Design a protein around this nucleic acid. Sequence first.
DNA 1: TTGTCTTATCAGATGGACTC
DNA 2: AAGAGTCCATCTGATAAGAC
Length: 96
Amino acid sequence: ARECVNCGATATPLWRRDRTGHYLCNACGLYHKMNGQNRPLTQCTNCQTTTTTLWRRNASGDPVCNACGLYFKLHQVNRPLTMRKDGIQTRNRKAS
DNA sequence: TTGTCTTATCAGATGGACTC
DNA sequence: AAGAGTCCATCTGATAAGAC
Ligand SMILES: [Zn+2]
Ligand SMILES: [Zn+2]
Ligand SMILES: [Zn+2]
């Protein structure tokens, strides 16, 4: 039940936090950082997944999922198909 | 019960569409 | 007409949760 504490949006291409760790949508997060006040009111080339919280690009400029993109950056080799975990994983990130 | 490694989820950078 | 500024999606980079 995540919600932008400024505008009330429940959907956004990227969730962000303010200095205190209060959640803000991408729009309200960028605005506050820039202005210092409140904002006024596809599939992976490697593993063929259609679901990720963040699309990245490979060296040729084609889309890869977050997992595949990060794996390649680290290892300089493509993510093997056997690494692909079923389901969606989430993590409780702490403040600051 | 600790250590490693994958990769979610945060933060920063870039630039197209739009207004001024 | 031609430049600077606003806005915010979407990209790259940083941090670190928790799978295993
Ligand atoms: Zn918002
Ligand atoms: Zn706040
Ligand atoms: Zn992938």
